[PDB]
Structures are given as C-alpha cells and as structure tokens.
C-alpha cells in the first residue's frame, strides 16, 4: 500500500492540434531532464476543426506515423483538452466520507453544480481540506468536461496502439514547460510576471503566469495559417507547399516585403491588443518578459520586432535548452521546432508529477 521497497515510468507527451500531432518523450536522471524522442506529423485537412476531432481515423493514422518517426517503444501517453471545455467549481461536502461514498454523492449531484447533462459528464474531483465555514464539512474541488472529449482521444490513441494514461488540460501543460524556461530568462521565478504567447496555425492564445502560475487567459482566432494562406495565393501553392516555404525558404525576393512583413505587423497588433486586456483586468502594470510559443514563433526576428514595438523583453520558448539529448534526436531540428513543442513538453512532464 505504502511500500516503496521497489524503486519503480515516463509518459509520451502527445499534443493534438488543428494541423498536426506533436510527440515528445522525456527522461530524467537526478535533477536534469533528457529528450529521448520527438516527432511531428501533419494532420489531414479538416481532421480536426478548431479543438474538435472529427476524422477519428485520420488522427489515428497520424499518431501511428508520428510513433515511427519518434522511434519510441512507449505506449502510454498524456493528452490534453482545452481549458475552455473544462468547468471548475468548489463545493462543500460532508467530512468523514470514504472515496466511494464521495464518488456516489458527486456522480449523483454533478448536474446540480455543472451545466453539462449527467450522462455526458466526465468529472474529476479533489478534497481540498476542511471547510472554513463549517469544520463538519470539507471543500471539494470539481473539474468537469463532456465525456465525448475524453472518449474521442482514447479511441484516437487506441488506433495507433497508444493509451491515454492521463487526460490533461493544456493550461497545465504550459505551466510545467514554462517552469523549465526559468533558466533562459531569469532564472528565478521571482514573481516573474510573464506573458506566454502561443501562436498556433489557426489559434493564438495569451497566457500570463505569475511565479509559475497561470492567471490571465484569452484567445484570438489569429494564426500562422493566415501567413500560409497568403503564401498560397501569391505564388499559387498548396497548403503543404506554403508551410514548407516558410521554413525552407526559396520564395522569390518580394516575399519579405509583400507578404512576411505585413504578417509580422499583424502578429504585433494581435499581441499588443491582447496584452492590453490583461493589464486592464488586473493589478499588474507590466510583464517582465514576453515568451513566444508555437511554430510561428520561429519566424526570424519576430521576437526582436515585438520587442521593439512594445518595449518588453521577448524571447522564443526553448524548454530543451538545458536538456540532455538522445543520440537519435537531431539538435538542429529540435531547436527549430522548440517553441511549437511547449505543450508536448508539458504533457510529457506530467510523468514526473
């Protein structure tokens, strides 16, 4: 029950988004972490719309291919749902109950506290401690989402021969990987108020963290796909080619002047406005750092541009800066893909919780 007579582990960090699937495997010896494997597999179009999986078979195939590229034997994974699909409430329950009695009361009365219909609820709970109002009672934390969100991921992973050991929340994954960034920035958490800007292909999310803890969160429909869509149109290229054009280069001379710079400015506008909301909605007046995450954060000197326009220290996220690397992992490819792997990193970090 309590025996640690055996010394034991790790779980695959699998980030499923609208456009791709990212896999990351970590290990640790003593204090410091090491990257055992990573890979990225693009998704078929419309396989995932917004945050919703639709082509269940499509995601499965991608997960199968991402395992082959990653070359890992691990079959357990941490996946995440969006925080927007999670309802969190604190309620009072009677103290002195077993876990079963506790689960019965919650399963029965879930609908009383959460908007979702009883049959569709997937609820996680945690006893916080004795209630301050009445010592005869305890405060219990509730977090619930529609069961369908969990079940589609189970089914998707199962097709690739993987299992979802933990269903996480994206915001939590971000925190765990942010905590590793400390070195790069400060280092110390030091009440560092940091704006993490995740610029995905279709979605951009601002998350402000105080001393390692998420506070503000908001999301705009801004993304790197708009850059891709512009590259497609000007040069007559498919979505596949446009994405490749951004990293590979090769596009003619007018690209920087006509396409990339206007997109960069749009990125700056989006970041600026997003940051305005946060200062307005709290006691915080400024942030110590801005951290750029997502694939679009790899755009050359995007950090410098944001830095000059806003006046706030801005850097591209690299959680793997102080990490050891497996010989199978290419340092160049990982470094170029580092900001897009913040979620995948945080998911893998759940293994060490």
Ligand X SMILES: Nc1ncnc2c1ncn2[C@@H]1O[C@H](COP(=O)(O)OP(=O)(O)O)[C@@H](O)[C@H]1O
- Residues lying near ligand X in the complex (CB under 6 A): 17-20, 200-203, 224-225, 228, 243, 246-247, 294-296, 298-299, 336, 340
Nearest CA to 73 out of 8, 7, 27 is that of: 27
Could you tell me which stretch among 175-183, 287-295, 302-310, 335-343 binds its own copies (CB under 8 A)? 175-183
CB of 179 to its own copies, least distance (A): 3
Residue 259 labeled ligand binder = no
144 binds, options its own copies, ligand X, Mg ion, none, Cβ within 5 to 8 A by partner type: its own copies
Find where tokens 């591209």 sit.
Answer: 316
Report how far residue 18's alpha carbon sits from residue 346's, in angstroms, rounded to the nearest whole number: 18
Could you tell me which stretch among 10-18, 130-138, 154-162, 171-179 binds Mg ion (CB under 5 A)? 10-18
> Does the protein bind Mg ion through residue 204 (CB under 5 A)?
no
Nearest CA to 203 out of 306, 308, 52 is that of: 52
| Token digits of residue 124 | 């996680």
Report how far residue 52's alpha carbon sits from residue 19's, in angstroms, rounded to the nearest whole number: 12
Interior angle at CA 192, CA 190 and CA 197, nearest 5: 150
CB of 296 to ligand X, least distance (A): 4
298 binds, options Mg ion, ligand X, its own copies, none, Cβ within 5 to 8 A by partner type: ligand X
Residue 201 labeled ligand binder = yes
Find where tokens 């596949």 sit.
Answer: 240
Return the number of the residue (67 or 169) whose C-beta is nearest its own copies.
Answer: 169
Report how far residue 227's alpha carbon sits from residue 239's, in angstroms, rounded to the nearest whole number: 11
Report how far residue 50's alpha carbon sits from residue 52's, in angstroms, rounded to the nearest whole number: 6
Q: Which residues bind its own copies (CB under 8 A)?
A: 2-8, 29-33, 78, 81, 86, 88, 122-126, 141, 143-145, 150, 154, 164-169, 172, 175-176, 179-183, 187-189, 212, 322, 324, 350, 352-353
């Amino acid at each position: 029950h309590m025996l640690g007579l055996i010394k034991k582990n790790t779980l695959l960090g699998i980030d499923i988004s609208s456009t791709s699937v990212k896999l990351l495997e970590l290990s640790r010896s003593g204090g410091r972490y090491k990257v055992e494997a990573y890979a990225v597999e693009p998704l078929p179009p419309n396989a995932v719309v917004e945050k919703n999986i639709v082509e269940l078979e499509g995601v499965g195939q991608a997960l199968s291919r991402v395992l082959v590229k990653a070359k890992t034997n691990l079959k357990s994974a941490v996946v995440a749902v969006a925080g927007s699909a999670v309802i969190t409430k604190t309620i009072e329950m009677e103290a002195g109950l077993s876990e079963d009695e506790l689960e019965n009361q919650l399963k029965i009365e879930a609908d009383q506290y959460i908007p979702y219909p009883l049959e569709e609820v997937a609820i996680d709970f945690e006893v916080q401690g004795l209630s301050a109002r009445n010592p005869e009672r305890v405060d219990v934390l509730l977090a619930a989402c529609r069961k369908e969100n969990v079940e589609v991921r189970e089914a998707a992973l199962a097709l690739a021969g993987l299992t979802a050991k933990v269903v996480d929340v994206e915001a939590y994954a971000l925190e765990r990987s942010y905590a590793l960034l400390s070195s790069q920035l400060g280092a110390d958490t030091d009440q560092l108020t940091v704006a993490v800007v995740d610029i995905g292909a279709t979605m951009t999310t601002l998350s402000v963290l105080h001393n390692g803890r998420t506070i503000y969160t908001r999301e705009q429909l801004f993304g790197g796909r708009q850059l891709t869509e512009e590259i497609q149109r000007r040069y007559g290229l498919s979505v596949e080619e446009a994405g490749l054009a951004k990293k590979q280069g090769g596009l003619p001379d007018d690209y920087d002047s006509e396409v990339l710079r206007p997109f960069k400015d749009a990125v700056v506008q989006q970041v600026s406005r997003s940051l305005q909301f946060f200062f307005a909605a709290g006691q915080f007046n400024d942030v110590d750092y801005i951290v750029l995450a997502g694939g679009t954060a790899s755009i050359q000197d995007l950090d410098r541009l944001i830095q000059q326009k806003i006046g706030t220290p801005t850097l591209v996220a690299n959680p793997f800066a102080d990490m050891a690397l497996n010989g199978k992992v290419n340092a160049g490819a990982l470094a170029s893909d580092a900001p897009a792997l913040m979620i995948a990193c945080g998911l893998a970090l759940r293994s060490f919780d």
